[PDB]
Amino acid sequence: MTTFRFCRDCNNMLYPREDKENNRLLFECRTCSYVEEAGSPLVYRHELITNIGETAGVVQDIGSDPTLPRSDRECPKCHSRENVFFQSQQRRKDTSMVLFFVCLSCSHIFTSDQK
Amino acid sequence: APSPISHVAEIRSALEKGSRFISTLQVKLYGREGSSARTIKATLPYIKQDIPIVIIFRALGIIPDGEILEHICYDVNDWQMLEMLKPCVEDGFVIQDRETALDFIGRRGTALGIKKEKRIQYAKDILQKEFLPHITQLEGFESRKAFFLGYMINRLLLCALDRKDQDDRDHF
Amino acid sequence: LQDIICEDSTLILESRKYEISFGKIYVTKPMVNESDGVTHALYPQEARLRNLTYSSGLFVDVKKRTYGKVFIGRLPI
Amino acid sequence: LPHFSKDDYSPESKGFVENSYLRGLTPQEFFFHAMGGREGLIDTAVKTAETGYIQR
Amino acid sequence: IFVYQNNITPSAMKLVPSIPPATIETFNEAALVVNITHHELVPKHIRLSSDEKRELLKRYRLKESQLPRIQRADPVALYLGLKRGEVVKIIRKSETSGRYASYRICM
DNA sequence: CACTCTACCGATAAGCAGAATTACCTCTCGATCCTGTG
DNA sequence: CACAGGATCGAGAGGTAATTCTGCTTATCGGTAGAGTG
Ligand SMILES: [Zn+2]
Ligand SMILES: [Zn+2]
Secondary structure, eight states: OOOOOBOSSSSOBOEEEEOGGGOOEEEEOSSSOOBOOOOOSOSOOOOOSOOSTTOOOOOSOGGGOSSSOEEOOOOTTTOOSOEEEEEOOOOSSSOOOOEEEEETTTTEEEEOOOO | OOSSOSOEEEEEEOOSSSOOOOEEEEEEEOOOSSOSOOOEEEEOTTOSSOEEHHHHHHHTTOOSHHHHHHHHOSOSSOHHHHHHHHHHHHHGGGOOSHHHHHHHHHHTSSSSOSOTTTHHHHHHHHHHHSSSTTTOOSSSOHHHHHHHHHHHHHHHHHHHTTSSOOOOTTOO | OHHHHTTSOOOOBOOOOEEOOEEEEEEOOOEEEOTTOOEEEOOHHHHHHTTOOOEEEEEEEEOOEEOOEEEEEEEEO | OTTSOTTOOOHHHHTOOOSOTTTOOOHHHHHHHHHHHHHHHHHHHHHHHHHHHHHO | OEEESSOOOHHHHHHTTOSTTOOOOEEEHHHHSSOSTTSTTSOEEEEOOHHHHHHHHHHHTOOSSSSOEEOTTSHHHHHHTOOTTOEEEEEEOOSSSSOEEEEEEEO
8 A cells, every 4th residue: 555566677567476486575566576675564455534634735835825824823843823724625525623733934734633 | 416516617708719619628527525436526527427537637638647647737746646546547547558548438429330440530530630629620739638627626536525615606 | 700710621532632711800890781682781770770780790811722701690799 | 715725614714694684784694695585585496396296 | 923133034924924824924133122002102902702793783884895995015914914804993082082993994 | 955047926126107276367379392293 | 385293310429417115027047856776
């Protein structure tokens, strides 16, 4: 799940296989017959829910947008009195209403989760 | 929900200076809930059956699957996109070059009117003329079409990955 | 109008080659033709009173070549 | 509305009218009242047809 | 009366209506766990004999088809073991009169 | 005792057809050509 | 000098969104007991 394995030779991807002979896990391109050591204890992973720490893309020049409201919360890092905040950008009916404050200076993200 | 389609993305391309065409390219996801298929197939015009996007990408010159995956998603940290695209790359193994992609596309076109020697030309003409007839209608410009298809697939996946909202029909 | 005129203004029919090559178009002021053939300027009040059509004729250049302005219709204004 | 800020959940921005008819309405609550009236008219138009068919 | 546990075989259901005039009735344990007669929405059902049915038809001057019908597969019909042509009597309570009597034919 | 299809019903999944309140008022148009003839 | 009767629209395509909840019919699969053996 960390990264889909791609063959160094050619450009295809490496499905996974078992080296029981050496009782090991080896990823195989099975097109050009390229096999490496393939050292990883994870094969597949599925995530049922979505976390809250994803915030947003937080692209630079976020302060250039005038539609984002401004607040006066103190930044934990630089102790500034100016910042912008927005709700979580995950679009579902179960997401909470926690605000993600973004510091225009020092490029810091701090949430309002006082739980 | 009763329909076997979960999410669908389409663009109604048209020409503002040339003759009116109004050709609809429809991209739909067949993975209704946890059906374990999770396959996406586009709806090419004049072909009554839906072809997987990997064959279309190969027909545009993007033969390797890694290049297609890079085109679809521009970030490597979004592992969810790769997880949902894994069935597509697994189903794209039927075609391994441009020639077999064109053969597959042509075999799903005319009702066996003539041999396969004309199916390649049929697929080439269909993709050059009525495959997104708003970016370009000339030859040798398949990279732009592939990039736009990747952008459309990325938008569809983002909508299906509870990251955006369904587009509103009433927006003026 | 000019775009539609010079969009597909070529019908090749076949050293025997026939072409039409429609040229630029011309739009004149509204006019009315009667039985006696005399043509005069038509005004909206007269058109409304006489149940006529406030339309102006269309003229395009035709240059046929093998290897002037002509009437093609009236456009309401 | 474009005159508000993003992620605003205040009652005034979400369609709550504070003034009365005698005092007069601001443009925002005027638009909200127009939307409510449109919804009412549509409801009556659909309901009359459906009720007529059911009664028949 | 035969009571099974989970399901009934269609092959046995084919021979269920055999060996006349004896009648074989099949029931499920899950359906028989609770009693539906005791429900407050189910009124009392009283079976009528042949003479009673004839007297009712003569008094009200009705044919067999001119009566309310109850399916043979109805849960109450299965509970009472009603047969084709049998008339049942239903006593209910109304807000307009203290008691009301209704008759239905198993058709 | 399961070996291979033979006969049975129970679900599922796509295609058809209908049908959409009542009453009333006014205007405004359209009911045809051309290749083939003496 | 002049009139007459039969059929739109064509390979080509596609001239194209705004409706659904029944019920009927026609594919489809998904099961379950036997005709006699080693
Ligand atoms: Zn490889
Ligand atoms: Zn800061």
